Enzyme design. Sequence first.
Site, PDB file in Angstrom:
ATOM      1  N   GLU A  17       0.837  -1.197   0.000  1.00 34.24           N
ATOM      2  CA  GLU A  17       0.000   0.000   0.000  1.00 34.24           C
ATOM      3  C   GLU A  17       0.876   1.252   0.000  1.00 34.24           C
ATOM      4  O   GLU A  17       2.101   1.193   0.170  1.00 34.24           O
ATOM      5  CB  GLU A  17      -0.916   0.026   1.239  1.00 34.24           C
ATOM      6  CG  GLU A  17      -2.366  -0.361   0.975  1.00 34.24           C
ATOM      7  CD  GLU A  17      -3.157   0.699   0.238  1.00 34.24           C
ATOM      8  OE1 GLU A  17      -4.395   0.557   0.208  1.00 34.24           O
ATOM      9  OE2 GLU A  17      -2.565   1.646  -0.312  1.00 34.24           O
ATOM     10  N   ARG A 107      -7.780   3.597  13.184  1.00 39.48           N
ATOM     11  CA  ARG A 107      -6.427   3.727  12.658  1.00 39.48           C
ATOM     12  C   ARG A 107      -6.450   4.723  11.506  1.00 39.48           C
ATOM     13  O   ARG A 107      -7.481   4.925  10.857  1.00 39.48           O
ATOM     14  CB  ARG A 107      -5.891   2.384  12.136  1.00 39.48           C
ATOM     15  CG  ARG A 107      -6.708   1.839  10.975  1.00 39.48           C
ATOM     16  CD  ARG A 107      -6.111   0.610  10.327  1.00 39.48           C
ATOM     17  NE  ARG A 107      -4.819   0.937   9.741  1.00 39.48           N
ATOM     18  CZ  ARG A 107      -3.977   0.038   9.242  1.00 39.48           C
ATOM     19  NH1 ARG A 107      -4.313  -1.247   9.210  1.00 39.48           N
ATOM     20  NH2 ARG A 107      -2.801   0.438   8.786  1.00 39.48           N
ATOM     21  N   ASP A 211      -9.726   2.060  -4.265  1.00 38.95           N
ATOM     22  CA  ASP A 211      -8.784   2.030  -3.144  1.00 38.95           C
ATOM     23  C   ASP A 211      -7.892   3.266  -3.252  1.00 38.95           C
ATOM     24  O   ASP A 211      -8.396   4.381  -3.074  1.00 38.95           O
ATOM     25  CB  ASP A 211      -8.087   0.657  -3.114  1.00 38.95           C
ATOM     26  CG  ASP A 211      -7.443   0.318  -1.777  1.00 38.95           C
ATOM     27  OD1 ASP A 211      -7.051   1.248  -1.031  1.00 38.95           O
ATOM     28  OD2 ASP A 211      -7.332  -0.905  -1.494  1.00 38.95           O
TER      29      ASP A 211
END
Length: 307
Positions: A17, A107, A211
């Site tokens: 990522e 988070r 994403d």
Amino acid sequence: GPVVEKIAELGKYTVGEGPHWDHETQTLYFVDTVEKTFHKYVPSQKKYTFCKVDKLVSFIIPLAGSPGRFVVSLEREIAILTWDGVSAAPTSIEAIVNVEPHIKNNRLNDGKADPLGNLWTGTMAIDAGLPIGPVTGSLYHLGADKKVKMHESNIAIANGLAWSNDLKKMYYIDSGKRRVDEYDYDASTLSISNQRPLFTFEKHEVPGYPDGQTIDEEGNLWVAVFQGQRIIKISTQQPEVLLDTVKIPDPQVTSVAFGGPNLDELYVTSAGLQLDDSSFDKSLVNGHVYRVTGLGVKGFAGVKVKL
Ligand SMILES: [Hg+2]
Ligand SMILES: [Hg+2]
Ligand SMILES: [Mg+2]
């Protein structure tokens, strides 16, 4: 068609990522959002390194003016890590701010500097789920005196960010919304308004979830499609226009960043994490990093965070 190369030198990631291309050093930095690791790849020298911490991480961006220092996430903290790019742990950690001190199960997730160097990033429940799960995230930027400002609430999975070249628009993804939104961005006040859908997956029979994303110099967005085995190229000039699709072997495409000497090689991260409600059998889900060439476009160098 474009050439999609699996980068053998890099191996497989649980959830690779947050790719960031530092153009001056011709180096790609990235993270694993589950394994608590940062990563560096120098393609011209075939050099790979990793760095371990004990908190969940989601982005890594060089600190403007400070070689050897990076702005990162550590769970809910934005921090500066001093890292030589090769040792398996940071030299030191300087916390800047905890964005959500009293939300114990949240988070940070995707983050990126705007073209002026301001870090934007958003949060999510650690146990967020798709298509439906806890929706506890918000979108922030880090402003003056190391304080954050909030721009949007009710975000399930805070994801990819980009800004138009004229600094009039911001683009943003909550994966749970299955769309890319556009906003009017006021560069002088660092505020966003007039949120509206730019591109809605269901209107184009695009599977999976948006994403990470990035923008090219022509203004096209390149969007990672998690559980879609692809990246898509979409217009920012007209709403709801799919310009192209590039299949990526890994089904769980996570994010994108332009790199290479000419900013025309698209690096693509993916996730090998095998999820119980997958549209793809486990044998297909690996987590490699890819490089796509021949797209006929150039992007921009990754922007450093200014503090
Ligand atoms: Hg590090
Ligand atoms: Hg680091
Ligand atoms: Mg992401």
